[PDB]
């Protein structure tokens, strides 16, 4: 790892993918299919629809396969089919490749209580994972009951992730104590939280902020503000720490149709080092103590 | 062994689309998608002119016609047909022969296929791909990868024979009941 | 190919050991389950518990009862989780003792929140259902396109019910 | 699927030097790098020597 220099090559937002396809993929595939632009034609909007619906990942190879398939069908139609030239349209795309696949850009849009979005820098690029929580035992078995709510974790988490979860649990309990002592929910209630796997082990802790906010949302029941994401390692006191894969998480977030994003103050430079269109239309938020995150996600 | 191998033996291929469509419709029922892909392959092989070959795998329950439809495709394209059972195999040597120095050394089964077919652009059908063992001193998965590499294939070679072989025009079909068990690179 | 497998559940210890009882109902899973399958099973367990809670507060059966469930093996590991909705409905049926509506199947993955996620091998599952003489079938809305890419006869006489959240399913399996 | 290999080819052609790829994923035999002993008949040298032979230059893009 240390013996050379590592150079990053990361992701392609819808615009970048569209440009790549127009200038690079379509001609190369056409040549692979032995065709002429006169005979086969694909509008840009068709490529936009493909990317937005028929391929969901930072890479582009799957888009290559889809465009290759449609060109193959066009070639078959040419050699024998009546049509002498092909002008692909959003109307004919269905017959050319079939009905759409990724109809929903996101898992959902409501984000009920006890679930929050987060950004994971998984090996296969960036992804948006929902971290959810739930109450798997009665909140008040007996109002006297004073035994602390046990916590259970799902997701094949490594001991490092388990410790991060415990830290987040303790800090969330303390924050609820300060903000609302009357609410013992997070204290006297056994809780089960699921953090989807796929995050590279190094990036695992990054979901600490997500876990804390999910637990708080469950405790107060206030659903987190929609079209919101976040990421950050928690400090057991409420200070946030930087994380890696910032560009990858940003591109994944934008692809997920999310608007307001939360990052630690430290990574700020990396967020600005990106391009403009990549950063276009993102209500970013840079924080250093968890209190600001609580204020943001819960405007009241 | 060497001279018996073909060199430039581009076994002739039919190109009448309607002919192949009728042939397949007669030899099998339904199975539309496979016929669609085959017609697309014929059309591209025609427009491109020179014949070529790629790698596609039929995955599904057993005894559904995968082998039968492979035979029908070999018939329709007029090219040779050969099958190779890979499930429960470890030694790539059978795939790659031996060094040719061991006592009673023989070349890799692909060499036998090439000789028997006596052609440069045959059809090969790998049976039960996902049942590879890839265990100790095995891991032929690397050998299969180089075999299916759309570029390394052009200069593939084995242990017994130490000369490159071009296979870009060769047609490969692979069969397996399930998808996931296949190694991701393949 | 496809197959129809009956997920089964039973109570392996007296429900009311103590009317005051404050223990946590255990859960045991059989059928040569992979770790991911065990996590999915626990997710289904927790969601079913919460659903019973919000729906039938008086029913502590699932909360305080040592249950054993058998999921017949054979499902390919990647497809394993697809039995999440089946597990949840089995647990709920046992809890309220109401048998599910006859000649009904289902398949889907549960998300610790009641939302259902798409699954693979829709065609084979549909063929298995049809060969099983089942009339009403339940699938996630997300796989809907796949179910409509199939020929008419294969889909003939199947009263499908596309859903997105487990709530819908609870209204079908238990019409009244 | 980012074009790493494609950009490798682009660098190779732009620099006028040669190109040669290599797969090491899931590999566990040192011989491929260090070849064989040259003693076992049918022994082969390291893949790097073969790349040098094919490109016939010591400034390739490996
Ligand atoms: N759609 C079909 N049309 C014609 N014959 C079929 C069809 N499906 C299955 N068969 C028959 O069933 C048998 C299945 O054997 P086989 O071809 O070995 O199946 P598989 O290819 O799945 O191993 C074949 O003899 C084949 O003729
Ligand atoms: N920015 C880009 N410009 C040109 N081609 C691209 C770009 N991004 C992806 N591709 C194409 O995608 C294909 C993916 O190739 P692949 O070997 O998967 O690359 P990688 O090793 O980065 O995954 C390449 O053939 C390349 O032409």
Q: Is A189 a catalytic residue?
A: no
User: B93 and B102 in contact (C-beta within 8 Å)?
Assistant: no
Atom index in ligand 1 nearest the CA of residue B30 equals 1
Cα–Cα distance for residue pair C30/D14, rounded to 1 Å? 61
Cα–Cα distance for residue pair A3/D56, rounded to 1 Å? 27
Q: Are strands A240-241 and A191-194 parallel, antiparallel or unpaired?
A: unpaired
3-state secondary structure of B17: helix
Nearest CA distance, A121 vs chain C (angstrom): 21
In this complex, whether C and A touch, counting 3 or more CB pairs under 8 angstroms, is yes
Which tokens belong to C21?
């009882």
Q: Are strands A228-230 and A260-264 parallel, antiparallel or unpaired?
A: parallel
Please report all neighbours of A, defined by 3+ CB atom pairs within 8 A. Answer: B, C, D
Name the nearest CA neighbour of B121 among B57, B176, B38, B50: B50
Burial class of residue D7 (count of CB atoms within 10 Å of its CB; 0-12, 13-18, 19+): exposed
Could you give phi then psi for residue B162, rounded to 5 degrees? -120, 45
Which tokens belong to A183?
């609410």
Q: Is A164 a catalytic residue?
A: no
Ligand 1 within 6 A of B63 CB?
A: yes
Name the nearest CA neighbour of B145 among D25, D44, D30: D25
Identify the experimental approach. Answer: cryo-EM
CB contact under 8 A, B61 and C1: yes
Cα–Cα distance for residue pair C169/C86, rounded to 1 Å? 10
User: A156 and C37 in contact (C-beta within 8 Å)?
Assistant: no
Cα–Cα distance for residue pair B16/B39, rounded to 1 Å? 10
3-state secondary structure of D26: coil
D25 in A contact zone (CB under 8 Å)? no
Q: Are strands A191-194 and A228-230 parallel, antiparallel or unpaired?
A: unpaired
Q: How far is the CA of B29 from the centre of ligand 1 (A)?
A: 10
Which tokens belong to A131?
């971290």
Own/partner pairs for D57-62, CB < 8 Å, 24+ apart?
D57/D17, D57/D18, D59/D17, D59/D18, D60/D12, D60/D17, D60/D18, D60/D19, D60/D20, D61/D8, D61/D11, D61/D12, D61/D15, D61/D17, D61/D18, D61/D19, D61/D20, D62/D20, D62/D22
The data reach a resolution, in angstroms, of 3.9
Cα–Cα distance for residue pair B52/B37, rounded to 1 Å? 14
Ligand 1 within 6 A of B88 CB?
A: no
Cα–Cα distance for residue pair A209/A243, rounded to 1 Å? 12
Among chain B residues, the shortest Cα distance to D20 is held by B152
Place of tokens 């990053």: A8
Place of tokens 């790998």: B126
Give the count of beta carbons closer than 10 Å to the beta carbon of residue A55: 20
Which residues contact residue A238 at a Cβ distance below 8 angstroms, ignoring those fewer than 6 apart?
A171, A175, A289, A290, A291
Give the count of beta carbons closer than 10 Å to the beta carbon of residue B121: 24
CB contact under 8 A, B99 and D23: no
**Atom 15, ligand 1: which residue's CA is nearest?**
B63
Give the count of beta carbons closer than 10 Å to the beta carbon of residue A153: 19
Place of tokens 């005894």: B63
User: Sign of the C-alpha dihedral, residues B23, B24, B28, B30?
Assistant: negative
In this complex, whether C and D touch, counting 3 or more CB pairs under 8 angstroms, is no
């Amino acid at each position: 790892r240390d013996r050379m220099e590592m150079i990053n090559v990361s992701g392609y937002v819808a615009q970048e993918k569209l440009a790549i396809a127009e200038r690079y993929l379509v001609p190369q595939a056409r040549a692979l299919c032995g065709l002429d632009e006169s005979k086969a034609k694909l509008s840009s909007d068709v490529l936009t629809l493909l990317i937005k619906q028929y391929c969901r990942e930072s890479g582009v190879r799957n888009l290559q396969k889809q465009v290759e398939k449609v060109l193959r069908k066009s070639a078959y139609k040419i050699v024998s089919g009546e049509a002498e030239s092909v002008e692909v349209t959003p109307e004919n795309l269905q017959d050319f490749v079939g009905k759409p696949v990724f109809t929903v850009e996101r898992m959902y849009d409501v984000t009920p209580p006890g679930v929050v979005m987060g950004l994971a820098w998984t090996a296969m690029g960036g992804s948006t994972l929902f971290v959810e929580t739930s109450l798997r035992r009665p909140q008040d078995k007996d109002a006297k009951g004073d035994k602390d709510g046990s916590l259970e974790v799902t997701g094949q988490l490594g001991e490092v992730m388990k410790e991060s979860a415990r830290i987040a649990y303790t800090f969330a309990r303390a924050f609820l104590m300060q903000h609302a002592p009357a609410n013992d929910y997070l204290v006297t209630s056994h809780i089960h939280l699921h953090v989807p796997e796929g995050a590279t082990p190094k990036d695992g802790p990054s979901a600490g902020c997500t876990i804390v906010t999910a637990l708080l949302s469950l405790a107060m029941g206030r659903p987190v503000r929609q079209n919101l994401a976040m990421t950050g390692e928690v400090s057991l006191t409420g200070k946030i720490l930087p994380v890696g894969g910032i560009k990858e998480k940003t591109i994944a977030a934008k692809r997920a149709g999310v608007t307001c994003i939360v990052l630690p103050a430290e990574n700020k430079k990396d967020f600005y080092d990106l391009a403009a269109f990549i950063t276009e239309g993102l209500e970013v938020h840079f924080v250093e103590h968890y209190r600001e995150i609580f204020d943001i996600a819960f405007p009241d | 062994w060497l001279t018996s191998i073909p060199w430039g033996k581009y076994s002739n291929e039919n190109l009448d689309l309607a002919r192949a469509q009728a042939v397949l419709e007669e030899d099998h029922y339904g199975m539309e998608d496979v016929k669609k892909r085959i017609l697309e392959f014929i059309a591209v092989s025609q427009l491109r002119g020179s014949t070529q070959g790629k790698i596609l795998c039929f995955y599904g329950p057993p005894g559904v016609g995968k082998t039968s439809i492979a035979r029908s495709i070999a018939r329709a394209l007029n090219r040779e047909y050969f099958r190779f059972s890979v499930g429960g195999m470890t030694d790539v040597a059978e795939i790659k022969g031996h060094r040719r120095t061991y006592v009673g050394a023989m070349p890799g089964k692909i060499i036998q296929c090439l000789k028997k077919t006596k052609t440069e652009n045959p059809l090969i059908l790998i049976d039960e791909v996902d049942k590879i063992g890839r265990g100790y001193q095995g891991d032929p998965s690397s050998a299969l990868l180089e075999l299916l590499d759309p570029e390394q294939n052009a200069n593939f070679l084995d242990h017994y024979l130490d000369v490159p072989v071009d296979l870009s025009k060769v047609l490969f079909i692979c069969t397996a009941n399930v998808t996931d068990t296949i190694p991701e690179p393949l």
